């Protein structure tokens, strides 16, 4: 039960990880978890505002 994942590499390779504890809180950090959702902070308005159209 070994998990093979891609290493952080530059642009323009793989690593194997096994869990030796059943605790699960004893695992390593989830470094490769990049997710972006700024829509809530930037625009929490009720009516969608198109850039081409004037605000008011």
């Amino acid at each position: 039960g070994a998990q093979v994942s891609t290493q952080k590499t530059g642009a323009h390779i793989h690593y194997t990880n096994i869990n030796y504890y059943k605790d699960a809180a004893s695992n390593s950090a989830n470094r490769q978890d990049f997710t972006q959702d700024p829509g809530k902070f930037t625009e929490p308005v009720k009516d969608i505002m198109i850039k081409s159209l004037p605000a008011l």
């Binding site: 809180a25 990049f34 850039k51 605000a55």
Partner: protein
């Protein structure tokens, strides 16, 4: 990764992206191409290091205390709280509620004190660190019966070995830890404001298992807190003034920012 710049040409039209209203509380989100002619660019930059897991998952010293192998002070007790150190604390206070796993690493060093004692022979010093849950019995003295650690997790470390490390699961009666609590513990509102039953972890007790030497020895223990599998909710503005008391956000009024000779000035 990040968004790629899009090539644009001179445009004359009724469309007015730059003009907008900031009263709506909506960010304009105007790209460079809307207001000027740009060239197509294939960006390869990635927002990897700016993630909360990458930002908060580092070991930071939160508290260091010392004890002796003789004399009055023979053991050291510290209650688990991250507000002791301003650095780790300020990073954590960025959000309102944070839920995360905790990893503890302890660095222990012993220094021989000045004494008139002669023929001093030292034996490898062994240190015992005991974790006590809230409501658990606390040892009155160094040679107390509590150090049996029947149901209390404890670690024994001998000098010259890698520092002891243990992993703690998220512990909170509430769904998530609360950085800032607005209110009073008492239903009558007659108590310390901001006190919460949440964020209570335990107390750490450190002592020397054996005296080791006839001559006096003093050892300092440093506690490191590394958050793991962290989660964040409700972002808030970063601290602007220096922390005075860990218990309350009490601060001294501080200048919004540094001054300059005048407006129109390009230097500090």
């Amino acid at each position: 990764r990040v968004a790629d710049t899009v090539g644009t040409g001179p445009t004359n039209s009724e469309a007015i992206p730059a003009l907008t209203a900031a009263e709506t509380g909506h960010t304009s989100q105007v790209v460079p191409g809307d207001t000027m002619q740009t060239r197509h660019v294939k960006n390869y930059h990635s927002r990897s290091e700016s993630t909360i897991e990458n930002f908060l998952c580092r070991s930071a010293c939160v508290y260091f205390t010392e004890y002796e192998n003789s004399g009055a002070k023979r053991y050291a007790e510290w209650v688990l709280t991250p507000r002791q150190a301003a650095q780790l604390r300020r990073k954590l206070e960025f959000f309102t509620y944070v839920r995360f796993d905790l990893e503890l690493t302890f660095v222990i060093t012993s220094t021989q004190q000045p004494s008139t004692t002669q023929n001093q022979d030292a034996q490898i010093l062994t240190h015992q660190i005991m974790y006590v849950p809230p409501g658990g019995p606390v040892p009155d003295k160094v040679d107390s019966y509590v150090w049996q650690t029947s149901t209390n997790p404890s670690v024994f470390w001998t000098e010259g070995n890698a520092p002891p490390r243990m992993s703690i699961p998220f512990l909170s009666i509430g769904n998530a830890y609360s950085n800032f609590y607005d209110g009073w513990s008492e239903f009558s509102r007659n108590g310390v404001y901001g006190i919460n039953t949440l964020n209570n972890m335990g107390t750490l007790y450190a002592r020397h298992v054996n005296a080791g030497s006839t001559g006096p020895i003093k050892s300092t223990i440093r506690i490191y807190f590394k958050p793991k599998h962290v989660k964040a909710w409700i972002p808030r503005p970063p601290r602007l003034c220096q922390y005075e008391k860990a218990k309350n956000v009490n601060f001294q009024p501080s200048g919004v920012t540094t001054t300059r000779q005048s407006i129109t000035t390009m230097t500090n």
